[PDB]
Design a protein around this ligand. Structure first.
Ligand code: 04C
Ligand code: 04C
Ligand code: 04C
Ligand code: 04C
Ligand code: CL
Ligand code: CL
Ligand code: CL
Ligand code: CL
Ligand code: CL
Ligand code: CL
Ligand code: CL
Ligand code: CL
Ligand code: CL
Ligand code: CL
Ligand code: CL
Ligand code: CL
Ligand code: K
Ligand code: K
Ligand code: K
Ligand code: K
Ligand code: K
Ligand code: K
Ligand code: K
Lengths: 201, 213, 219, 199, 216, 204, 196, 199, 196
């Protein structure tokens, strides 16, 4: 995998790759690594595939119950904390999952990174997966709080695409979301290699 | 010590069309350098709408198919209807994950129709990570079956081919061809090829002979 | 591999399949395993492919050189002792299981030699991963002083059994008959599997592959 | 393997089973483990097939030269000594026990054990994996001053009893009798094996 | 069982017209040592299904008692129902996998022969739960030695008379004795038919050792 | 795996009076890719080529040491090398390192100088020769390449069609291997000419 | 863990190396040089095992120098790179192998500016740009993003700046100073060291 | 250990050596390995001393209760079954073979082997580490229908031959004879042991 | 690998912690806080295993808070430190132990300023000054050199400065920003973060 998310003046954008690898072999190249929990919650996936799928769906299962119980929807802080606690119950058992939680609650735009270890931090920028270092490089070189929706779409697209070029285990397509005040809207599902040729003029 | 697993071979393939689903496999059951039986098809009818294909450790595949069978009955007594293709695929994911720390050494592929009558295929790993796709192969010869399907069904790496929709006839030959190729290279693939066709009419089985060496 | 040897009334007969495996994938469908040593001494090789190839070629190289220096019909017992002393020196690291058969002034002879350098002389034998299938057929149907054709059929059956029952065995059964008169290397004697015919055409009209760079060098 | 040698007045008797094994499989059900070292010196083979045979060859090589240099048939003592020396020099690398028995003019019929590189003369000797199951029998069934025919039965009986019990022993019984007059090689087949308690 | 003590080698199975025939030698080995050369590795489950077992003998005797009681329990009800060969096969499969999944396996390979409803039954059961049906069956070294023989005959002649099956089985026991170091020359033949199960007393396969003179 | 470290894909195909050889252009260390224009096919003569898949060092080392021996052959002998002879020369070179082998599995494709005949072969990492009338494959995606070639290859292909077939076989097998790609290079060998092409392969 | 980087332009090669001499948890030196002068127009940047780097680098350095004395002219950047490749590859399947990762920058009067990348396994590759060390994982993408083969020296130093700023921001290790030198037609020019 | 049991008409004979060992040291040179389970059922002990003795106690416990509940002397079949069950239930945790022999009114004199958790009745049975060295002897020296005195000699001879060969066997031979009339316990001392070939 | 430091004076406790959230080779965060508020006058600084630190620190944090609600007054810095010591020590000989190294700073209305050091083994020691992490090896000597028990806050911040400058100069890891807070009679005061 490669996975990225950053926030700016117009919300939070989220971009992932779509490659699934078994050993040295590409098992799936059209793998969905974003989970759309509610209209304004978003989860990314990295690590052991079945671990990610199950556990973030189990978070989604609980974010559902919270809304039906409290009748007021769940906060971003609550969700990412609940996932961290699920991870902590299975300590030192070999679960491999790296996830970022995105959303919009009363506190504004919420961005969170949750580990399989239990690690949980809030921030402006995060990147997970085997190609996170490449995604970071292009992100930082060309980031400012004063990005426009078009500039941010360019950056997140660029960051995954360039990461997938260097990373053996990243490829397929870029899947991008814009987290707006009134929920996320899915931006694009663009082929990675097509972009790399476009960026090569 | 003692190993709870054995490798028994077998490759399983599924392809989705407009109103049909195909699940195909070899009939070879093996262990080490010996063949257990030449008459072991991996396709299994679950409902009139859904068919499963299991490969890997046959002990796991047998017990798992029996779990699904029982779970299908449990659902229908409780819900007053048949478990849909998508529901079976969702249930299979959870069953496989309940064994995350002592997994079924198993490669499952689900083939059937969705609620709109359209063809649906679900590909799994031994631990329950799954998604829907147009075509997928699992098992010992899956890497042999995949690239040809990627090129012909996905139209990948081609410039001015007009992108013709997938027909039953064409997919049938495609299924036959990839297995004929795999039987020539994979030592665990051979004997016979069984194809299960899922349609609105139901399940029809077809058998084509393969290399017996 | 399945390889086998058989003694009959008028000479010896050697058998082999034609399959080679890299990992668990059939690399070669038509590789030759019955190797030339002398004009009337032949050797079947099982195990590490390159190892059975070099040992057998080395033995043949030493056997021609021996026949040149003596001016005599090479002895199969000479082949067997050269082979085993070479293999014993390498302490089984050269993975070559060999069935050597031929005709001497002392009549028809059949030996088997294992990678560690042990040997045995016998009327019938089988080596390789399909050896179990072949000895089964031999212990079942072998008789002393068989006719060439009765001996040729049993050997085919022994290799066939190996091909069909063993996953590391396939292709055609190769035979080599050695008589006090001469040697006939009947390559692809019997061929059980056939699938060359099909009905799937996968052609691509010149220009479907996208190209970025073209270069032509005139000759 | 099961191998055995017995001493009598005129010479010796040497017996063996006819099996070679790799794991649980038998690869040769009719193998003669009685290799000549000289004209009236034989040796009984056990252990690693390749290791044993290699020792047998070099022993037979040196005894041929030694025999010619002395212009006389090699002493059984001499024979045993050369096998003992190769076995000792490569005790970690060669893994085989060889019983050496024969006849010479100086000392008559003799039986020698060389396991691991030691040397001992015995009135009779057993060896191989199947020897474990017949230690009790040979101690009870032995008499000093047995006739050639009695020694022949004694070895046959003991090897039969071992082969039936031992999974690594099987096939036929190869017998050689070495005297002043020469070597008598005979084979005891399946129908001809002495019967005992089998349940 | 983590490490088996006393084991039995290959069990044979092949189905003829109007029944099934099973063979297994009367040997129980302790490692390489032939410990018991007159013990039965076959049982009559009921009048329709029979069983020969490879591997650990104590595990076989345990399974022999559990199956023995199940048949007794069923005979007590006398409700016109009995276990079919397939039913015994299905139970055994479920038993082995269950024990295997608790990491405490019954160290056995099984061949189940049966006759019911005019159809012959032959089923294979592994210690890991591997189960299937085949016209001919051979466990352990039999799978490498006897199984090739059976298949080559059944290819040329799918239907065999009871006599033809018997002589084929005796021929296979000959190969097994020659080639298996963990085998013995005392064996039994079991047969299912319309009449029921018949286990025959101590048998020996005819051996020939004339190739012992063909080394000069 | 040791071969897995660097990855790579080499393939050869036969046609009507012609041969084709193809390789990926990737140079990468396990996790990352370093170079996009790495060489794996090397000309051992006009109309004779060797493609090398495996550990990048041994790929280069074998190519340089084979050239050493080839040039001495072509100087001592008064001729250019026949395809069978190169195969045997690579076989000897590799087998010499029997118990410390070069981690590469070579593919030889060419036309016999003088005689015209097409020749293809692949070898072990310890020098076992494989000669076929159709195709040979080597690399981390052997299984993928086998699946394509078996399904795609035909007995009498003209240069135009052969290039398309070997390309499509390489393109799609590489797209299933995570350690192969970054472009594909194809050499088509005829009597009159040699045609070299880099394809528009996936750059992910 | 150290860092090397090279950027090749149309008529020049820009190289940079960190100046840290680290042992366990301490920085022993602030001003250590990881560049070696082989010729008037060849630099060899070495990285890896502590004792092995300098010994190997100097051995190659002294032989390129030996060639110059024995022939009255220097080795071409290619011939140099291929020589150092041979020496490493020959020690690979030996009892003592060298765990060194290196970067050779040079200017040929015929071929022009050259940049060579080499594994500790001794695989050689020519590249328009390359970087060694864990920092490469964070900088190769920046390089991939803004590199054009027609980059000017003014823009190249600015591109190196962008890469080194990333190592300060995201890289866990403390590398505050770097050696910066340019090779061209006139030779090797020491440039203002970039400090943070 | 070496342990042995033989069946005759009126009952059975049970013999054992008298050694217990830890490594190369013997810690008890006079130990009786013939434990009563009931009044006319004995068992012969081998393997782990603690494991064996523990099985012997629980077997004797259950057979006492079982005997009282049936108000009849326990069947030898029943005895063998209880020892067999404990041995099977803890085959990985308990490491001992126990020969169970005795006499009852229903089936006379009987001999049972229970090694590893299996159950088999035999005309005679041997066990222990020293059993390996006497497999050949017992097969050759056995006759069906031996008198009490002959059976007594047969066990004595076989155990003597095993003890001399086996390093883990030594001491004296403990013999018990179980008939309808009762139990006769006798000891065969060092001076009284039968002589064979010793070289 | 992280850094914690505490300096206790006559009437105040100065504490500082680095602000890096590191994963493998990257700095995920520049502004992460490793201080936990337990009371109005108790801070718990935690360091160690990634998932274990926050979970353990918050568990103790929530129980000190529970005590406040249940009793109307807060735990003394000593009682707090001894509570957290008990909880770690009880998990030591268990199936899952916490690999956390911590520093408790506090002000008692009776005893005064307090600084507690704790192992991952759960050994507790009261100290005039202490530091956690590999940086301690380089800074404990500086602290030993210039520390007097009568140090003023102005001089203590200057002493912390001297210690943090050493981490920039000699420590291999990149820790450019630190949290600095002082505990006294009036409570916890956020102080200007020291950046480099
Ligand atoms: C990139 C591609 C690098 O792996 C991503 O991390 C991707 C994550 C992802 C998340 C959701 C949906 C799709 C993809 N990861 C994988 O592709 C992942 C790699 C992985 C394998 C094993 C691990 O545990 C030590 C950690 C990461 N691949 C898988 O999860 C595959 C499908 N699963 C298996 O191979 C299952 N095994 C486990 C044991 O039984 C045998 C097979
Ligand atoms: C049958 C097919 C195997 O069941 C034969 O033994 C056959 C022998 C043969 C083949 C061609 C020509 C003459 C004789 N053996 C092979 O097919 C052999 C398989 C093998 C692989 C690894 C082994 O373990 C050391 C032993 C046997 N084929 C090969 O050697 C292939 C071509 N090469 C490899 O698999 C690579 N080896 C080289 C040796 O080191 C291990 C990897
Ligand atoms: C009886 C039958 C049981 O071994 C005899 O000892 C027999 C004696 C013999 C002597 C000369 C010629 C033929 C037979 N020995 C064998 O049959 C022998 C058993 C053995 C194998 C490995 C050993 O460890 C070094 C020791 C003894 N069998 C063989 O050597 C056969 C031909 N080959 C193999 O088993 C190959 N081995 C080599 C060593 O590593 C395991 C695989
Ligand atoms: C003969 C004498 C040699 O073993 C018999 O088997 C004898 C039988 C016996 C039974 C009941 C009462 C007395 C004697 N067994 C022993 O002498 C026995 C040897 C043995 C030890 C460990 C074994 O595997 C677990 C199997 C057999 N001796 C002992 O048990 C002595 C008293 N103690 C030890 O050996 C101490 N051991 C316990 C196991 O771990 C190593 C240290
Ligand atoms: Cl259609
Ligand atoms: Cl040779
Ligand atoms: Cl003796
Ligand atoms: Cl019985
Ligand atoms: Cl088994
Ligand atoms: Cl159950
Ligand atoms: Cl079936
Ligand atoms: Cl060379
Ligand atoms: Cl005492
Ligand atoms: Cl214990
Ligand atoms: Cl509280
Ligand atoms: Cl502790
Ligand atoms: K799930
Ligand atoms: K487990
Ligand atoms: K998978
Ligand atoms: K048998
Ligand atoms: K070079
Ligand atoms: K003693
Ligand atoms: K501890």
């Amino acid at each position: 995998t490669t996975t990225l998310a950053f926030k700016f003046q117009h919300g939070v954008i989220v971009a992932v790759d779509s490659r699934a690898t078994a050993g040295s072999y590409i098992s799936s190249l059209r793998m969905n690594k974003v989970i759309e929990i509610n209209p304004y919650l978003l989860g990314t996936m990295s690590g052991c595939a079945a671990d990610c799928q199950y556990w973030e769906r189990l978070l989604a299962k609980e974010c559902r119950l919270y809304y039906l119980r409290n009748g007021e929807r769940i906060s971003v802080s609550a969700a990412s904390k609940l996932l961290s606690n699920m991870m902590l119950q299975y300590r030192g058992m070999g679960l491999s999952m790296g996830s970022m939680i995105c959303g919009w609650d009363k506190k504004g735009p919420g961005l969170y990174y949750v580990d399989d270890n239990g690690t949980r931090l809030s921030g402006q920028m995060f990147s997970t997966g085997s190609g996170n270092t490449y995604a970071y490089g292009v992100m930082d070189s060309g980031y400012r709080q004063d990005l426009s929706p078009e500039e941010a779409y360019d950056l997140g697209r660029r960051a995954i695409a360039y990461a997938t070029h260097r990373d053996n285990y990243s490829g397929g397509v870029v899947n991008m979301y814009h987290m707006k005040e009134d929920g996320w809207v899915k931006v694009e599902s663009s082929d990675v290699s097509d972009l790399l040729y476009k960026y090569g003029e | 010590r003692f190993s709870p697993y054995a490798f028994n071979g077998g490759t399983v393939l599924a392809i989705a069309g407009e109103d049909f689903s195909i699940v195909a496999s070899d009939t070879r059951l093996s262990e080490g350098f010996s063949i257990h039986t030449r008459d072991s098809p991996k396709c299994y009818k679950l409902t009139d709408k859904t068919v499963i294909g299991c490969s890997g450790f046959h002990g796991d595949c047998l017990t798992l198919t029996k779990i699904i069978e029982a779970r299908l009955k449990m659902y229908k007594h409780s819900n007053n209807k048949a478990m849909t293709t998508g529901a079976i695929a969702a249930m299979l994911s959870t069953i496989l994950y309940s064994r995350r720390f002592f997994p079924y050494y198993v490669y499952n592929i689900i083939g059937g129709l969705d609620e709109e009558g359209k063809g649906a295929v679900y590909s799994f790993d031994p631990v329950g990570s799954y998604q829907r796709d147009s075509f997928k192969a699992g098992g010992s010869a899956s890497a042999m079956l995949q690239p040809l399907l990627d090129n012909q069904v996905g139209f990948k790496n081609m410039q001015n081919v007009e992108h013709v929709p997938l027909t039953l006839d064409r997919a049938m030959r495609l299924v036959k061809d990839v297995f004929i190729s795999a039987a020539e290279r994979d030592v665990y693939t051979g004997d016979a090829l069984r194809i299960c066709i899922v349609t609105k009419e139901g399940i029809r089985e077809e058998t084509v002979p393969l290399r017996k060496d | 591999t399945t390889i086998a040897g058989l003694v009959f009334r008028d000479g010896v007969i050697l058998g082999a399949d034609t399959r080679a495996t890299n990992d668990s994938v059939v690399a070669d469908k038509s590789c030759e395993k019955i190797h030339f040593i002398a004009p009337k001494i032949y050797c079947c090789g099982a195990g590490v492919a390159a190892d059975t190839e070099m040992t057998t070629r080395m033995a043949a190289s030493k056997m021609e050189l021996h026949a040149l220096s003596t001016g005599r019909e090479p002895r199969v017992a000479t082949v067997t002792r050269i082979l085993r002393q070479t293999l014993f020196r390498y302490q089984g690291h050269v993975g070559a299981s060999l069935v050597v058969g031929g005709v001497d002034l002392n009549g028809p002879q059949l030996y088997e030699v294992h990678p560690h350098g042990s040997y045995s002389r016998l009327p019938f034998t089988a080596l390789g991963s399909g050896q179990g299938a072949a000895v089964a057929l031999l212990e079942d149907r072998f008789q002393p002083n068989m006719t060439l054709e009765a001996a040729q059929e049993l050997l085919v059956e022994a290799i066939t059994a190996g091909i069909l029952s063993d996953l590391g065995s396939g292709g055609n059964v190769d035979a080599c008959v050695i008589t006090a008169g001469g040697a006939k290397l009947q390559r692809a004697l019997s061929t059980p599997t056939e699938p060359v015919q099909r009905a799937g055409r996968y052609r691509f009209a010149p220009g479907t592959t996208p190209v970025l760079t073209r270069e032509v060098r005139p000759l | 393997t099961t191998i055995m040698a017995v001493e009598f007045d005129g010479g010796v008797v040497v017996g063996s089973d006819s099996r070679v094994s790799a794991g649980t499989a038998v690869v040769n059900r009719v193998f003669d483990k009685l290799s000549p070292l000289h004209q009236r010196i034989f040796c009984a083979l056990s252990g690693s097939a390749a290791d044993a045979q290699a020792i047998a060859d070099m022993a037979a090589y040196q005894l041929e030269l030694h025999g010619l240099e002395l212009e006389e048939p090699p002493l059984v003592l001499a024979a045993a000594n050369v096998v003992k020396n190769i076995s000792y020099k490569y005790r970690e690398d060669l893994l085989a026990h060889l019983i050496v028995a024969g006849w010479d003019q100086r000392e008559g019929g003799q039986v020698y054990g060389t396991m691991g590189g030691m040397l001992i003369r015995q009135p009779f000797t057993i060896g191989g994996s199947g020897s474990s199951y017949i230690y009790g029998y040979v101690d009870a069934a032995y008499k000093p001053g047995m006739t050639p025919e009695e020694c022949r039965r004694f070895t046959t009986n003991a090897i039969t009893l071992a082969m039936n019990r031992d999974g690594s022993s099987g096939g036929v019984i190869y017998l050689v009798t070495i005297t002043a007059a020469g070597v008598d090689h005979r084979v005891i087949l399946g129908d001809e094996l002495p019967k005992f308690y089998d349940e | 069982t983590q490490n088996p003590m006393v084991t039995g080698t290959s069990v044979l199975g092949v189905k003829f017209d109007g029944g099934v025939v099973i063979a297994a030698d009367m040997l129980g080995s302790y490692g390489s040592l032939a410990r018991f050369r007159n013990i039965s590795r076959i049982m009559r489950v009921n009048d329709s299904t029979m069983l020969g077992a490879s591997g650990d003998y104590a595990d076989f005797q345990y399974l022999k008692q559990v199956l023995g009681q199940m048949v007794i329990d069923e005979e007590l009800l006398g409700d016109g129902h009995s276990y079919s060969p397939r039913a015994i096969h299905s139970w055994l499969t479920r038993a082995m996998y269950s024990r295997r999944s608790k990491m405490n396996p019954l160290w056995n390979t099984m061949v189940i022969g049966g006759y019911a409803d005019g159809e012959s039954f032959l089923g294979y059961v592994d210690m890991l739960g591997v189960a299937y049906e085949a016209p001919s069956l051979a466990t352990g070294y039999g799978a490498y030695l006897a199984q090739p023989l059976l298949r080559e005959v059944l290819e040329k002649q799918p239907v065999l008379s009871q006599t033809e099956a018997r002589e084929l089985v005796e021929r296979c026991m000959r190969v097994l004795y020659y080639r298996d170091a963990r085998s013995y020359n005392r064996f039994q033949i079991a047969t299912v038919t319309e009449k029921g199960v018949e286990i025959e007393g101590p048998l020996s396969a005819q051996t020939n050792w004339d190739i012992a003179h063909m080394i000069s | 795996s040791i071969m897995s470290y660097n990855g790579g894909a080499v393939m050869a195909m036969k046609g009507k009076n012609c041969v084709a050889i193809a390789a990926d252009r990737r140079f990468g260390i396990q996790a990352q890719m370093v170079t996009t224009d790495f060489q794996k096919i090397f000309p051992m003569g006009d109309r004779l080529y060797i493609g090398l898949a495996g550990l990048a060092t041994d790929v280069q080392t074998v190519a340089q040491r084979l050239k050493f021996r080839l040039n001495l052959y072509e100087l001592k002998e008064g001729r250019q090398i026949k395809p069978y002879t190169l195969m045997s020369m690579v076989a000897n070179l590799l087998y010499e390192k029997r118990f410390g082998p070069y981690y590469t599995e070579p593919v030889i494709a060419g036309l016999d100088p003088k005689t015209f005949k097409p020749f293809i072969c692949s070898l072990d990492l310890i020098g076992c020769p494989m000669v076929t009338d159709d195709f040979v494959v080597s690399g981390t995606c052997s299984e993928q390449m086998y699946g394509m070639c078996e399904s795609l290859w035909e007995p009498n292909m003209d240069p135009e069609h052969l290039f398309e077939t070997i390309s499509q076989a390489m393109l799609n097998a590489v797209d299933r291997d995570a350690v192969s790609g970054m472009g594909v290079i194809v050499h088509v060998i005829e009597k009159d000419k040699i045609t070299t092409r880099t394809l528009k392969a996936r750059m992910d | 863990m150290e860092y090397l980087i090279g950027i090749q332009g149309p008529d020049y090669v820009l190289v940079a190396s960190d100046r840290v001499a680290a042992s366990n948890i301490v920085q022993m030196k602030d001003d250590h040089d990881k560049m070696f002068k082989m010729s008037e127009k060849i630099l060899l940047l070495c990285v890896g095992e502590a004792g092995d780097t300098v010994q190997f680098a100097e051995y190659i350095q002294k032989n390129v120098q030996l060639y110059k004395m024995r022939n009255g002219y220097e080795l071409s950047p290619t011939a140099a790179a291929n020589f150092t490749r041979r020496n490493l590859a020959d020690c690979l399947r030996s009892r003592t192998p060298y765990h060194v990762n290196l970067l050779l920058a040079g200017y040929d009067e015929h071929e022009g500016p050259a940049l060579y990348y080499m594994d500790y396994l001794a695989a050689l590759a020519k590249a328009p740009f390359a970087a060694h060390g864990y920092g490469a994982f964070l900088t190769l993408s920046i390089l991939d993003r803004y590199y054009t083969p027609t980059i000017s020296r003014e823009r190249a130093v600015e591109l190196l700046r962008k890469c080194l700023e990333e190592l300060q921001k995201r890289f866990i290790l403390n590398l505050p100073t770097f050696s910066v030198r340019v090779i061209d037609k006139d030779g090797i020019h020491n440039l203002e060291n970039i400090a943070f």
